[PDB]
Amino acid sequence: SGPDEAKIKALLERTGYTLDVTTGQRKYGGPPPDSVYSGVQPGIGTEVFVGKIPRDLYEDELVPLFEKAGPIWDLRLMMDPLSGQNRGYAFITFCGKEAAQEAVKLCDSYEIRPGKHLGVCISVANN
């Protein structure tokens, strides 16, 4: 297990996004390169929750899929600091509401690995 360093490296060389690893989290972009998006942090309705991510799957797989909805502002893959695998979920901020809704339409139930379907929804606050 663990992310494939070569695959991650080629991803960042292709897209130019930053990738910052902290305890419990991998943050892709946030902000993206301003060539992708200049502007204030995207607001309400622009973030999706992505669940049921296979625990050994990392950004080299997630980013090309969700880029099909639109340009990514940030991707935060939550990590288990004890196992060094991801926690099974991530938050993805897009640059607009329309792209976030497109991520739900395209990627909710997407079979990213055999037998493993993602759950995707607009991330909203509780009450």
PDB file of C-alpha atoms in Angstrom:
ATOM      1  CA  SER A   1       0.000   0.000   0.000  1.00  0.00           C
ATOM      2  CA  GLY A   2       0.851   3.685  -0.132  1.00  0.00           C
ATOM      3  CA  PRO A   3       0.697   6.067  -3.088  1.00  0.00           C
ATOM      4  CA  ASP A   4       2.842   5.407  -6.151  1.00  0.00           C
ATOM      5  CA  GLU A   5       5.397   8.218  -6.046  1.00  0.00           C
ATOM      6  CA  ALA A   6       6.160   8.037  -9.771  1.00  0.00           C
ATOM      7  CA  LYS A   7       2.463   8.227 -10.655  1.00  0.00           C
ATOM      8  CA  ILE A   8       1.935  11.169  -8.294  1.00  0.00           C
ATOM      9  CA  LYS A   9       5.013  12.959  -9.676  1.00  0.00           C
ATOM     10  CA  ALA A  10       3.850  12.718 -13.289  1.00  0.00           C
ATOM     11  CA  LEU A  11       0.421  13.998 -12.242  1.00  0.00           C
ATOM     12  CA  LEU A  12       1.831  17.183 -10.693  1.00  0.00           C
ATOM     13  CA  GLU A  13       4.199  17.711 -13.628  1.00  0.00           C
ATOM     14  CA  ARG A  14       1.204  17.465 -15.963  1.00  0.00           C
ATOM     15  CA  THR A  15      -1.247  19.684 -14.054  1.00  0.00           C
ATOM     16  CA  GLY A  16       1.101  22.008 -12.140  1.00  0.00           C
ATOM     17  CA  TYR A  17      -0.952  21.835  -8.932  1.00  0.00           C
ATOM     18  CA  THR A  18       0.665  21.843  -5.511  1.00  0.00           C
ATOM     19  CA  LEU A  19       0.278  18.802  -3.261  1.00  0.00           C
ATOM     20  CA  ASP A  20       0.812  19.271   0.475  1.00  0.00           C
ATOM     21  CA  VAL A  21       0.948  16.313   2.840  1.00  0.00           C
ATOM     22  CA  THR A  22       0.095  16.949   6.503  1.00  0.00           C
ATOM     23  CA  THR A  23      -0.865  14.625   9.300  1.00  0.00           C
ATOM     24  CA  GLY A  24      -4.202  13.094   8.359  1.00  0.00           C
ATOM     25  CA  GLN A  25      -4.575  14.852   5.010  1.00  0.00           C
ATOM     26  CA  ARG A  26      -3.330  15.203   1.442  1.00  0.00           C
ATOM     27  CA  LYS A  27      -4.292  18.550  -0.120  1.00  0.00           C
ATOM     28  CA  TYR A  28      -4.164  18.873  -3.912  1.00  0.00           C
ATOM     29  CA  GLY A  29      -4.312  22.449  -5.120  1.00  0.00           C
ATOM     30  CA  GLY A  30      -6.057  24.859  -2.767  1.00  0.00           C
ATOM     31  CA  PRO A  31      -5.470  27.243  -4.464  1.00  0.00           C
ATOM     32  CA  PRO A  32      -5.071  25.791  -7.961  1.00  0.00           C
ATOM     33  CA  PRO A  33      -2.566  27.456 -10.300  1.00  0.00           C
ATOM     34  CA  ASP A  34      -3.939  30.869 -11.149  1.00  0.00           C
ATOM     35  CA  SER A  35      -3.689  29.878 -14.821  1.00  0.00           C
ATOM     36  CA  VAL A  36      -6.458  27.390 -14.028  1.00  0.00           C
ATOM     37  CA  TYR A  37      -8.435  29.791 -11.841  1.00  0.00           C
ATOM     38  CA  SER A  38      -7.852  33.310 -10.576  1.00  0.00           C
ATOM     39  CA  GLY A  39     -10.391  34.567  -8.073  1.00  0.00           C
ATOM     40  CA  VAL A  40     -11.605  34.313  -4.488  1.00  0.00           C
ATOM     41  CA  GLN A  41     -12.117  30.928  -2.847  1.00  0.00           C
ATOM     42  CA  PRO A  42     -15.235  29.250  -4.322  1.00  0.00           C
ATOM     43  CA  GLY A  43     -18.306  29.634  -2.155  1.00  0.00           C
ATOM     44  CA  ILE A  44     -21.355  27.672  -1.114  1.00  0.00           C
ATOM     45  CA  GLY A  45     -22.417  24.759  -3.275  1.00  0.00           C
ATOM     46  CA  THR A  46     -18.992  24.294  -4.907  1.00  0.00           C
ATOM     47  CA  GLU A  47     -17.714  21.413  -2.744  1.00  0.00           C
ATOM     48  CA  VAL A  48     -18.553  17.714  -3.056  1.00  0.00           C
ATOM     49  CA  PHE A  49     -18.101  14.910  -0.563  1.00  0.00           C
ATOM     50  CA  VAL A  50     -16.596  11.778  -2.178  1.00  0.00           C
ATOM     51  CA  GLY A  51     -17.121   8.592  -0.183  1.00  0.00           C
ATOM     52  CA  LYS A  52     -16.341   4.880  -0.428  1.00  0.00           C
ATOM     53  CA  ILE A  53     -12.941   5.592  -1.982  1.00  0.00           C
ATOM     54  CA  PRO A  54     -10.850   2.394  -2.004  1.00  0.00           C
ATOM     55  CA  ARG A  55      -8.320   2.816   0.785  1.00  0.00           C
ATOM     56  CA  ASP A  56      -5.256   2.334  -1.466  1.00  0.00           C
ATOM     57  CA  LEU A  57      -6.389   4.773  -4.197  1.00  0.00           C
ATOM     58  CA  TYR A  58      -4.746   8.197  -4.445  1.00  0.00           C
ATOM     59  CA  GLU A  59      -4.680  11.371  -6.521  1.00  0.00           C
ATOM     60  CA  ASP A  60      -3.293   9.824  -9.710  1.00  0.00           C
ATOM     61  CA  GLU A  61      -6.676   8.086 -10.042  1.00  0.00           C
ATOM     62  CA  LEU A  62      -9.020  10.585  -8.391  1.00  0.00           C
ATOM     63  CA  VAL A  63      -7.905  13.763 -10.149  1.00  0.00           C
ATOM     64  CA  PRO A  64      -8.340  12.594 -13.790  1.00  0.00           C
ATOM     65  CA  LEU A  65     -11.824  11.314 -12.986  1.00  0.00           C
ATOM     66  CA  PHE A  66     -13.126  14.417 -11.238  1.00  0.00           C
ATOM     67  CA  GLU A  67     -11.474  16.746 -13.760  1.00  0.00           C
ATOM     68  CA  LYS A  68     -14.131  15.409 -16.119  1.00  0.00           C
ATOM     69  CA  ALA A  69     -16.675  17.452 -14.149  1.00  0.00           C
ATOM     70  CA  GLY A  70     -14.580  20.626 -14.328  1.00  0.00           C
ATOM     71  CA  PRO A  71     -11.361  22.223 -13.054  1.00  0.00           C
ATOM     72  CA  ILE A  72     -10.526  21.361  -9.449  1.00  0.00           C
ATOM     73  CA  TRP A  73      -9.972  24.160  -6.946  1.00  0.00           C
ATOM     74  CA  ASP A  74      -8.849  21.770  -4.189  1.00  0.00           C
ATOM     75  CA  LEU A  75      -8.933  18.038  -3.311  1.00  0.00           C
ATOM     76  CA  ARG A  76      -8.455  16.997   0.338  1.00  0.00           C
ATOM     77  CA  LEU A  77      -8.034  13.196   0.665  1.00  0.00           C
ATOM     78  CA  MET A  78      -8.321  12.346   4.337  1.00  0.00           C
ATOM     79  CA  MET A  79      -5.617   9.955   5.609  1.00  0.00           C
ATOM     80  CA  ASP A  80      -5.349   7.484   8.463  1.00  0.00           C
ATOM     81  CA  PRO A  81      -2.045   8.417  10.168  1.00  0.00           C
ATOM     82  CA  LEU A  82      -1.742   4.930  11.685  1.00  0.00           C
ATOM     83  CA  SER A  83      -2.150   2.815   8.541  1.00  0.00           C
ATOM     84  CA  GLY A  84      -0.849   5.237   5.920  1.00  0.00           C
ATOM     85  CA  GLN A  85      -3.923   4.543   3.787  1.00  0.00           C
ATOM     86  CA  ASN A  86      -6.688   7.007   3.077  1.00  0.00           C
ATOM     87  CA  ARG A  87      -9.785   7.121   5.297  1.00  0.00           C
ATOM     88  CA  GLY A  88     -12.167   6.271   2.438  1.00  0.00           C
ATOM     89  CA  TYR A  89     -13.319   9.821   1.707  1.00  0.00           C
ATOM     90  CA  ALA A  90     -12.264  13.190   0.335  1.00  0.00           C
ATOM     91  CA  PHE A  91     -13.636  16.675  -0.213  1.00  0.00           C
ATOM     92  CA  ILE A  92     -13.335  18.299  -3.635  1.00  0.00           C
ATOM     93  CA  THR A  93     -13.916  21.995  -4.199  1.00  0.00           C
ATOM     94  CA  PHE A  94     -14.657  23.003  -7.780  1.00  0.00           C
ATOM     95  CA  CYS A  95     -14.428  26.491  -9.267  1.00  0.00           C
ATOM     96  CA  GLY A  96     -18.194  26.797  -9.744  1.00  0.00           C
ATOM     97  CA  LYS A  97     -21.510  25.371  -8.637  1.00  0.00           C
ATOM     98  CA  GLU A  98     -22.185  23.910 -12.089  1.00  0.00           C
ATOM     99  CA  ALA A  99     -19.005  21.784 -12.041  1.00  0.00           C
ATOM    100  CA  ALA A 100     -19.780  20.495  -8.540  1.00  0.00           C
ATOM    101  CA  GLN A 101     -23.261  19.448  -9.676  1.00  0.00           C
ATOM    102  CA  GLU A 102     -21.682  17.825 -12.736  1.00  0.00           C
ATOM    103  CA  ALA A 103     -19.382  15.825 -10.418  1.00  0.00           C
ATOM    104  CA  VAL A 104     -22.465  14.426  -8.665  1.00  0.00           C
ATOM    105  CA  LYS A 105     -24.140  13.640 -11.998  1.00  0.00           C
ATOM    106  CA  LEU A 106     -21.077  11.926 -13.502  1.00  0.00           C
ATOM    107  CA  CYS A 107     -19.393  10.345 -10.489  1.00  0.00           C
ATOM    108  CA  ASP A 108     -22.033   9.360  -7.927  1.00  0.00           C
ATOM    109  CA  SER A 109     -22.060   5.516  -8.099  1.00  0.00           C
ATOM    110  CA  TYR A 110     -19.006   5.499 -10.389  1.00  0.00           C
ATOM    111  CA  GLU A 111     -17.310   2.062 -10.265  1.00  0.00           C
ATOM    112  CA  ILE A 112     -13.764   3.395  -9.813  1.00  0.00           C
ATOM    113  CA  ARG A 113     -12.433  -0.140  -9.152  1.00  0.00           C
ATOM    114  CA  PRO A 114     -14.235  -3.439  -9.805  1.00  0.00           C
ATOM    115  CA  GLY A 115     -17.098  -3.760  -7.320  1.00  0.00           C
ATOM    116  CA  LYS A 116     -16.317  -0.397  -5.659  1.00  0.00           C
ATOM    117  CA  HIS A 117     -18.809   2.419  -6.353  1.00  0.00           C
ATOM    118  CA  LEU A 118     -18.149   5.973  -5.228  1.00  0.00           C
ATOM    119  CA  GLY A 119     -20.675   8.049  -3.310  1.00  0.00           C
ATOM    120  CA  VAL A 120     -20.719  11.699  -4.385  1.00  0.00           C
ATOM    121  CA  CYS A 121     -22.907  14.540  -3.119  1.00  0.00           C
ATOM    122  CA  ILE A 122     -22.864  18.298  -2.655  1.00  0.00           C
ATOM    123  CA  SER A 123     -21.281  18.997   0.722  1.00  0.00           C
ATOM    124  CA  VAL A 124     -23.678  21.081   2.831  1.00  0.00           C
ATOM    125  CA  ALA A 125     -23.764  22.107   6.468  1.00  0.00           C
ATOM    126  CA  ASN A 126     -25.854  20.375   9.124  1.00  0.00           C
ATOM    127  CA  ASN A 127     -28.552  22.028  11.237  1.00  0.00           C
TER     128      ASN A 127
END
